[PDB]
Design a protein around this ligand. Structure first.
Ligand SMILES: Cc1cc2nc3c(=O)[nH]c(=O)nc-3n(C[C@H](O)[C@H](O)[C@H](O)COP(=O)(O)O)c2cc1C
Ligand code: SF4
Ligand code: SF4
Ligand code: SF4
Ligand code: SF4
Ligand code: SF4
Ligand code: FES
Ligand code: FES
Lengths: 107, 186, 107, 262, 117, 425, 42
């Protein structure tokens, strides 16, 4: 609810919060997460705009297989996005997306 | 073909002009005295006029007279369009097909010439008399059709007049400038 | 830009206020360098006092962080001072992420 | 010496210094195809186009000198629109050899598309192919992969001595070959394969043996032929196969010996 | 589309489809694939050393994706059980070329792969 | 303020009867001794005071270009350069300035010899026009032997020798940098224009490039008064230039006309096809090959002067009419103009060798109708790009007419694509 | 064998083979390179 990752707040979420810090109430919320998770999956099925699958800019994601065989720049970028990496901008960044266990604080 | 050169029966045998050798030396003196590569551009035009169809070995002999690089002098004639590449007949004519001529019909003059003098468009005569080739521009665009044969360019011709001039050229020269109307203003 | 840009800067000036507020105290003992880029704040701290910096942000009237959760360290042999211990801090009441770094060689 | 600011930062340069030569002092490398180290200054590509502070037309870095105190930006709006465009023109008539091509990562044109050129799409339909030029022992030359520039053309005329490479046509048919069927002389012309940016001229002895990716490089002076120093040798597991000339200030003029290259 | 045991495909009129690039070598996150290339007799230049370790390889389909010629195509495979590591790790093509028994399925599966799904 | 057409005034009038002595009676070398006795500074000032624009397809003033060299101190001896060969198609100036009156062209080199300060003068003629080149060579034999130019002639200290050289017939006569490289002996390719022009270094000498019509106007401007040349035309651009009409016309003829003249009046005098601008659809181009085709709506307001022509679409530089009728195809005609540049591309700058050849291949598809409706807008971005990032002016010359397809037109191009989309697909 | 036919290329094996296992005629590793040559002769 606080930090959106990829199209959030638009999808309706329900977060189970108990009262006692015991093992039973910490188990009940996990089952209450499971019953209030299909709401998101159903809303994912409701909202699906048809379009691009990868980023159209070919400096990040490799182009289509039918595209690379004919056009020139596509295959050279295919040759350099593989073997060689991405050529990333320098800087330290920290991201955390909600794991069902906790967090994945990639730094 | 522009880059590739044949090695069979047109690579070793070459002849240079002996009577025009004194005239070719005088042409080199017209430019700068020290460091003269300008003669190579002039001798290449003189070689085609004296001998029909320039040989690959003949260009090397012409480069030796001016004392220049053999590869550089061979490349100098490759960029030029006026110089002969493979083979030319007794009277070779080039037809103009550019937009200033195509606006008042230029393709009709070429199609009528193709049927009268035989062959398609690129192929020359088997008996070697007339060779046809597509040209960019003849130079003088005052007349609606333009065709340059050997040296003198013939301008202004009808559908039947072009065929009559071509058949007459087989035995006697037809001269001519713009045989359809006044030269300057009409 | 539609697919090229991730997010436009709007909270960048709001987060820059923290870059002034802590720096308004102005300790040579604590502050030194304040870096702010891509909706995130980075502070490096003089080796002599690290505990007084960590007691700050904990509680505090203006900003309540409390959770000094994730803790990383950087190995880099370019500088004369080798290691760089990096603290990743998160607020629940305030909803913000701030960074605490150490500059010393710490052998 | 006259000083002129490039990208706001001021840098002192000589009166007869080039625009790209002035850019090196500010620690910025412009996109190149026609050399600046030892080969003579020539245009015939227009890749290194840079826009001045107040100019209607962009000037080439190889030809145009700084002269007067004028501001020139490397990361300008006009320059980025130029660099993406010229790359598309270079690749409209390019044979597509990248996986088969002898170079791959070492190719200068391969990097410039990734760094400067347009990524998303390239508008092209139907590319012309050139016939294979004759070559002797070293460098298995392919005329199709060649971009038709002036780098190896001037190398044979100035650096090597014996001239062979030049022009053959006019449009998109002009080949960089010798035109007459003759093998290239030895002397010091074995270093011509290392000079070319594209994967057109590459050593036949060590062709397709190892790519630029996954090869450990080490600098060592050559034993064969005297006064030879700084030559990078790629390990690429167990036995070394490719040896390239390393840059030296006084010992060697960025060219390996023909006996040492093979 | 399912990834199992590796097998390299070929053209309908003979000829090995693998062109030798070292492309799939560098992408490989396990570094299971090794490639050393030499010219084939005269003219053609297609492979000599081609070993894929099954002691390594975490199965990505990255080598399937990085390949411009579509040589390594991952076939529906489950059956692989050996007595030694030596019997398990794949030799210089050969056993990979012996994937002809699965290449009939691969040709059917790739028809559902061009213009993805 | 309004300009009248000719009215017993011409730079070159003799075309019917001229050889060597016949031209002399009808105004030729009248003040040959007077111009030679005058100083180099005073003779150069006469061209600057008149304000004559450049006859060649560039737009640069002739007064500023001749004064650009000046020569304060010279180590290497200076040489004079002149271009006479046909560059852009639709021009008749090549076979009129030298072919009809060869004595006037030879006098132009002598008038600019003492002014610029050149040891020798050189002229370049077209390889295809051999008959016109023979007339120029015959005039040199009648001038050097008799005593017109060379060593010491007409009471002059400065020596000038005229020599004519046959050209290849391509872009070598086109660009100003190309003429220096072609005359030197090297392959037909222009030198780098940004660092050094003709004045700094051309064939190992300080030189100046001049057009066939521009050089011929110099003795006429020197002999007659300075106000006479500036009388006809506009304030910015003044001087009579030879305009030739070719294509769809009742009678195709080249005639000398005054500057700042309307297009409707010039076409009516020479007589065009069907109508001047009422029945037949207007597709006439102000330039020979450089400038794009003018619209049907704006044609009467357009003037012959370069300063007035720049206000609407593009300026006229070559000054040649290329009129096309309503019955004649528009798409196929402009595609042939680009095909001219496909053959006349030299082979240096990469957005031209692999540029124009790429441009012609897309343009050939529009005649057939296989091209997509989206491809029209994409081609406009490429066409604009070639104009800026090229060494020589021929890169611009191929860029401008393609821009005239997207502008003014567009439903004409869309109709060709829509016709093949329903019939074939 | 009913609707979708298998494609013929004359490269695929006509007779189907069983698993390698611990039994004879099984999988094996093999060397590839010709190595660095060294020779001495009288
Ligand atoms: C495609 C093209 C062709 C040209 N052809 C010629 C030519 O044949 N002769 C010429 O004198 N100028 C020609 N020019 C004009 C040149 O730019 C010329 O060298 C010079 O800049 C004009 O100055 P001038 O009038 O003093 O010669 C041509 C320009 C272009 C764009
Ligand atoms: S020359 Fe460079 S970009 Fe072109 S195919 Fe070869 S490696 Fe790729
Ligand atoms: S072979 Fe290489 S150096 Fe030579 S012209 Fe072609 S691209 Fe330039
Ligand atoms: S499997 Fe594909 S990417 Fe790997 S070497 Fe063979 S052809 Fe190249
Ligand atoms: S599936 Fe992954 S780990 Fe296995 S060979 Fe391919 S790239 Fe390497
Ligand atoms: S623009 Fe074209 S014709 Fe002009 S110099 Fe460049 S490549 Fe040659
Ligand atoms: S355009 Fe045909 S003669 Fe010039
Ligand atoms: S890189 Fe400067 S002109 Fe080619």
């Amino acid at each position: 609810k606080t930090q959106p990752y990829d199209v959030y707040d638009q999808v309706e979420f329900d977060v189970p919060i108990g009262s006692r810090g015991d093992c039973y109430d910490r188990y009940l919320c996990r089952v209450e997460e499971m019953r209030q998770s299909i709401r998101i999956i159903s809303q994912c099925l409701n909202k699906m705009p048809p379009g691009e699958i990868k980023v159209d800019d070919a400096k990040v994601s490799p182009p289509k297989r039918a595209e690379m065989k004919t056009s020139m720049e596509s295959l050279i970028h295919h040759f350099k996005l593989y073997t060689e990496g991405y050529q990333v901008p320098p800087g330290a960044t920290y991201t955390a997306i909600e794991a069902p266990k906790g967090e994945f604080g990639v730094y | 073909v522009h880059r590739d050169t044949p090695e069979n029966n047109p690579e070793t045998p070459f002849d240079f002009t002996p009577e025009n050798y004194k005239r070719i030396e005088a042409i080199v003196k017209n430019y700068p005295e020290g460091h003269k590569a300008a003669a190579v551009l002039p001798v290449l035009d003189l070689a085609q006029r004296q001998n029909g169809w320039l040989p690959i070995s003949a260009m090397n002999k012409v480069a030796e007279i001016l004392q220049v690089p053999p590869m550089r002098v061979y490349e100098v004639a490759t960029f030029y369009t006026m110089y002969n590449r493979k083979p030319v007949g007794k009277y070779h004519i080039q037809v103009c097909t550019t937009t200033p001529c195509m606006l008042r019909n230029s393709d009709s003059i070429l199609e009528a010439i193709q049927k009268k003098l035989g062959i398609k468009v690129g192929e020359t005569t088997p008996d070697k008399l007339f060779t046809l080739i597509e040209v960019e521009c003849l130079g003088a665009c005052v007349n609606a059709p333009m065709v340059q044969i050997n040296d003198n360019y013939y301008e202004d011709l009808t559908p039947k007049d072009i065929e009559e001039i071509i058949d007459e050229l087989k035995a006697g020269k037809i001269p001519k400038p713009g045989p359809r109307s006044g030269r300057f203003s009409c | 830009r539609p697919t090229v840009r991730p997010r436009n800067d709007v909270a960048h000036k709001q987060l820059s206020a923290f870059g002034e507020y802590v720096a308004e105290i102005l300790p040579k003992y604590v502050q030194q360098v304040q870096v702010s880029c891509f909706n995130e704040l980075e502070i490096c701290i003089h080796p002599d006092g690290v505990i007084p910096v960590l007691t700050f942000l904990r509680d505090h009237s203006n900003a309540q962080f409390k959770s000094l959760a994730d803790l990383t360290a950087v190995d880099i042999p370019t500088r004369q001072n080798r290691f760089e211990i990096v603290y990743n801090l998160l607020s629940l009441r305030f909803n913000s992420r701030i960074r605490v770094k150490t500059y010393t060689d710490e052998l | 010496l006259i000083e002129v600011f490039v990208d706001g930062q001021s840098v002192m340069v000589e009166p007869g210094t080039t625009v790209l030569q002035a850019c090196e002092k500010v620690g910025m490398q412009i996109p190149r195809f026609c050399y600046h180290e030892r080969l003579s200054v020539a245009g015939n590509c227009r890749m290194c186009l840079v826009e001045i502070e107040k100019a209607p037309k962009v000037v080439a870095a190889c030809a145009m000198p700084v002269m007067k105190g004028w501001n020139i930006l490397t990361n300008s709006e006009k320059t980025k629109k130029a660099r993406e465009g010229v790359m598309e023109f270079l690749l409209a008539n390019h044979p597509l050899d990248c996986p088969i091509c002898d170079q791959g990562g070492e190719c200068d044109l391969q990097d410039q598309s990734m760094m400067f050129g347009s990524d998303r799409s390239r508008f092209l339909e139907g590319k012309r192919a050139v016939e294979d030029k004759n070559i002797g022992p070293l460098v298995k030359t392919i005329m199709t992969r060649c971009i038709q520039c002036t780098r190896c053309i001037r190398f044979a005329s100035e650096i090597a001595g014996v001239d062979d490479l030049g022009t053959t046509g006019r449009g998109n048919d002009m080949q960089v070959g010798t035109y007459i069927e003759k093998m290239f002389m030895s002397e010091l012309s074995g270093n011509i394969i290392d000079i070319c940016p594209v994967g057109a001229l590459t050593x036949x002895x060590x062709x397709x043996x190892x790519x630029x990716x996954x090869x450990x490089x080490x600098x060592x002076x050559x034993x064969x032929x005297x006064x030879x120093x700084x030559x990078x040798x790629x390990x690429x597991x167990x036995x070394x196969x490719x040896x390239x000339x390393x840059x030296x200030x006084x010992x060697x003029x960025x060219x390996x010996x023909x006996x040492x290259x093979x | 589309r399912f990834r199992g045991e590796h097998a390299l495909r070929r053209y309908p009129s003979g000829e090995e489809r693998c062109i030798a690039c070292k492309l799939c070598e560098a992408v490989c996150p396990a570094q299971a694939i090794t490639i050393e290339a030499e010219p084939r007799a005269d003219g053609s230049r297609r492979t000599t050393r081609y070993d894929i370790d099954m002691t390594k390889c975490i199965y990505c389909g990255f080598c399937q994706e990085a390949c411009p010629v579509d040589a390594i195509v991952e076939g529906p495979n489950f059956e692989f059980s050996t007595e030694t590591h030596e019997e398990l790790l794949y030799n210089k093509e050969k056993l990979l070329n012996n994937g002809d028994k699965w290449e009939a399925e691969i040709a059917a599966n790739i028809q559902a792969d061009y213009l993805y799904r | 303020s309004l300009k009248d057409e000719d009215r017993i005034f011409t730079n070159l009038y003799g075309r019917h009867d001229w050889r060597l002595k016949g031209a002399q009676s009808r105004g030729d070398w009248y003040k040959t001794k007077e111009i030679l006795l005058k100083g180099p500074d005073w003779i150069l000032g006469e061209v600057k005071t008149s304000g004559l624009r450049g006859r060649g397809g560039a737009g640069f003033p002739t007064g500023l270009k001749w004064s650009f060299m000046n020569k304060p101190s010279d180590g290497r001896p200076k040489y004079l350069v002149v271009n006479a060969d046909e560059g852009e198609p639709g021009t008749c100036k090549d076979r009129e300035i030298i072919r009809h009156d060869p004595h006037k062209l030879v006098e132009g080199c002598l008038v600019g010899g003492r002014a610029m300060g050149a040891r020798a003068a050189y002229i370049y003629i077209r390889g295809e026009f051999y008959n016109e080149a023979s007339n120029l060579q015959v005039a040199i034999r009648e001038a050097y032997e008799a005593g017109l130019i060379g060593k010491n002639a007409c009471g002059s200290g400065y020596d000038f020798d005229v020599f004519v050289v046959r050209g290849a017939g391509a872009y070598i006569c086109g660009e100003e940098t190309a003429l220096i490289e072609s005359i030197e002996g090297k392959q037909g390719k222009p030198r780098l224009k940004p660092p050094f022009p003709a004045d700094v270094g051309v064939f190992g000498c300080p030189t100046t490039v001049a057009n066939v019509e521009t050089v011929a106007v110099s003795p006429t401007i020197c002999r007659r008064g300075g106000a006479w040349f500036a009388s006809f035309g506009r304030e910015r651009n003044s001087g009579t230039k030879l305009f030739n009409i070719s294509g769809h016309v009742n009678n195709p003829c080249t005639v000398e006309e005054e500057m700042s003249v309307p297009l409707k009046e010039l076409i009516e005098k020479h007589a065009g096809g069907v109508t001047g601008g009422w029945d037949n659809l207007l597709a006439v181009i102000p330039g020979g090959s450089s400038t794009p085709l003018i619209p049907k709506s704006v044609c009467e307001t357009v003037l012959m002067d370069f300063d007035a022509l720049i206000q609407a679409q593009t300026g006229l530089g070559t000054a040649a009419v290329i009129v096309m009728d309503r019955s004649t195809d528009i798409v196929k005609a402009i595609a042939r103009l680009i095909e001219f540049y496909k053959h006349e591309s030299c082979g240096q700058c990469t957005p031209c060798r692999e540029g124009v050849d790429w441009m012609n291949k897309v343009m050939a598809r529009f005649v057939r109708g296989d091209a997509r409706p989206a491809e029209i807008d994409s081609l406009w971005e490429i066409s604009k790009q070639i104009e800026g990032h090229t060494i020589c002016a021929l890169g611009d010359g191929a860029a401008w007419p393609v821009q005239g397809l997207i502008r003014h037109f567009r439903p004409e191009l869309e109709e060709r694509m829509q016709q093949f989309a329903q019939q074939h697909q | 064998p009913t609707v979708k036919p298998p494609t013929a290329r004359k490269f695929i094996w006509t007779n189907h083979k069983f698993n390698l296992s611990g039994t004879p005629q099984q999988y094996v590793p093999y060397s590839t390179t010709r190595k660095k040559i060294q020779e001495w002769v009288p």
